[PDB]
């Protein structure tokens, strides 16, 4: 049995180490595999033999007694957002654990945290209020009201300015909806 | 070369219907598998396949058939399709010497329903960028909403001036339910585009935002008194404006 963290969070710039630990029985080697949303899954390593390997930005470690692996991932990109599996073969034949989605949280270089209101483009005075432009360790608060829905939080790139920001997007079906409430 | 491709992308099966996923590899791979993997969640070995004329049973065999007539193709079938069955469906492929890793394709996502009466197009909404956000950080955010889909069988795309754009777009990885607390409630997906003050300004400037759904064939039976929510792309679109 593959058992792997469902969720982990870093931020871009740093090292973060995922571990897997397997149950022996008929160990032929560990694998670990990156998937993207919702993409095909794509080889990283294969490891037999202890300890610990360089494959670029990644590495790769293996403890043949401690039934026990990690992945280390240094220099964190936001790419590198995925789920990643540890899987374990015994040579045809690969069983994988359950995954680990990692969020890479982007660096903020100068954050204004703000709440805007846009207006629908066609009608009927509907509208979204957006929270964008906080830094990454703010915690954007979910609906406890069952009218309003507030989405996660996402990191957009322009890349062609080299800025990054984090937004989430909340509206109602009901009007008048308060846009300064929601995320707070 | 190409790897290993699959089909179809996208099928929604009312419960007791048979379908078939195809799977194909030009890598001459002795090696090909079928797996299941539920949202997010991992993958689950159905059934696979050492060579031509053999097959064998994985982790969660019932109850699929398979087939491996030729080296290149594998065949997984569903004779009587049950809601359990509602998943994404990934191919794999191995050569036999002397390893090593497996070669995946893109999936099929499959949702079974009890009923097809469920099955919503979304309707797409364009949210024009806050003229506070313009002139405080001289970018602009352009919203985009996907709501009342279902199935979640959707792909969300931004196009400015009939070009396809990757570059300052968020989508949400994955909806919201916008009924919780119902099993088959239907989905809102939201898409931002950032865009500079000066880009948005422009009146020659158009912005759309894309929702494809997978939806009802011409094969399915529809009886409701509702447009039948066929395959179809929903779209919205801005204009740039000086004020």
């Known amino acids: 049995n593959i058992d792997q963290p469902t969720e982990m969070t870093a931020t871009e710039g740093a090292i973060v180490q995922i571990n897997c630990t397997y149950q022996?029985?008929?160990?032929?080697?560990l694998f670990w595999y990156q998937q993207h949303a919702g993409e095909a899954p794509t080889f990283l390593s294969y490891?037999?033999?202890?300890g610990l390997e360089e494959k670029g930005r990644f590495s790769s470690f293996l403890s043949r007694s401690k039934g026990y692996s990690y992945l280390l991932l240094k220099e964190l990109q936001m790419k590198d957002s995925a789920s990643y599996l540890c899987?374990?073969?015994?040579?045809?034949?690969?069983?994988f654990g359950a995954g680990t989605r990692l969020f890479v949280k982007a660096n903020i270089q100068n954050p204004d945290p703000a709440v805007y209101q846009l207006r629908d483009s066609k009608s009927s005075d509907k509208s979204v209020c957006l929270f964008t432009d906080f830094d990454s360790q703010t915690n954007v608060s979910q609906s406890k009201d069952s009218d309003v829905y507030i989405t996660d939080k996402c990191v957009l790139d322009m890349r062609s300015m080299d800025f990054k920001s984090n937004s989430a997007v909340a509206w109602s079906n009901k009007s008048d909806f308060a846009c300064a409430n929601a995320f707070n | 070369n190409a790897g290993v491709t699959q089909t179809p992308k996208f099928r929604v099966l009312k419960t007791g219907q048979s379908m078939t996923l195809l799977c194909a590899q030009d890598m001459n791979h002795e090696y090909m598998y079928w797996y299941r993997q539920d949202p997010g969640m991992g993958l689950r070995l159905i059934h696979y396949?050492?060579?031509?004329?053999?097959?064998a049973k994985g982790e969660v065999p019932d109850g699929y058939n398979v087939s491996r007539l030729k080296k290149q193709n594998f065949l997984l079938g569903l004779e009587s399709a049950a809601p359990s069955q509602t998943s994404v469906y990934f191919c794999?492929?191995?050569?036999?010497?002397?390893?090593?890793?497996?070669?995946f394709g893109p999936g099929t996502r499959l949702t079974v329903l009890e009923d097809l009466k469920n099955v919503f197009p979304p309707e797409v909404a364009v949210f024009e960028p806050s003229e506070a956000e313009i002139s405080h950080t001289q970018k602009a955010t352009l919203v985009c909403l996907a709501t009342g889909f279902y199935p979640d069988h959707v792909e969300l795309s931004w196009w400015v001036n009939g070009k396809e754009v990757h570059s300052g777009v968020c989508t949400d990885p994955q909806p919201l339910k916008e009924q919780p607390a119902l099993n088959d409630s239907r989905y809102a997906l939201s898409s931002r585009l950032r865009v500079s003050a000066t880009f948005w300004q422009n009146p020659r400037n158009h912005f759309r935002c894309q929702v494809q759904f997978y939806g009802l064939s011409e094969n399915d039976e529809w009886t409701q008194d509702r447009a039948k929510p066929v395959t179809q792309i929903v779209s919205a679109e801005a204009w740039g404006r000086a004020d």
């Open positions: 396949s050492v060579g031509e004329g053999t097959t």
């Open positions: 899987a374990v073969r015994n040579g045809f034949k690969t069983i």
């Open positions: 022996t029985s008929g160990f032929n080697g």
């Open positions: 794999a492929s191995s050569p036999r010497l002397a390893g090593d890793e497996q070669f």
């Open positions: 490891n037999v033999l202890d």
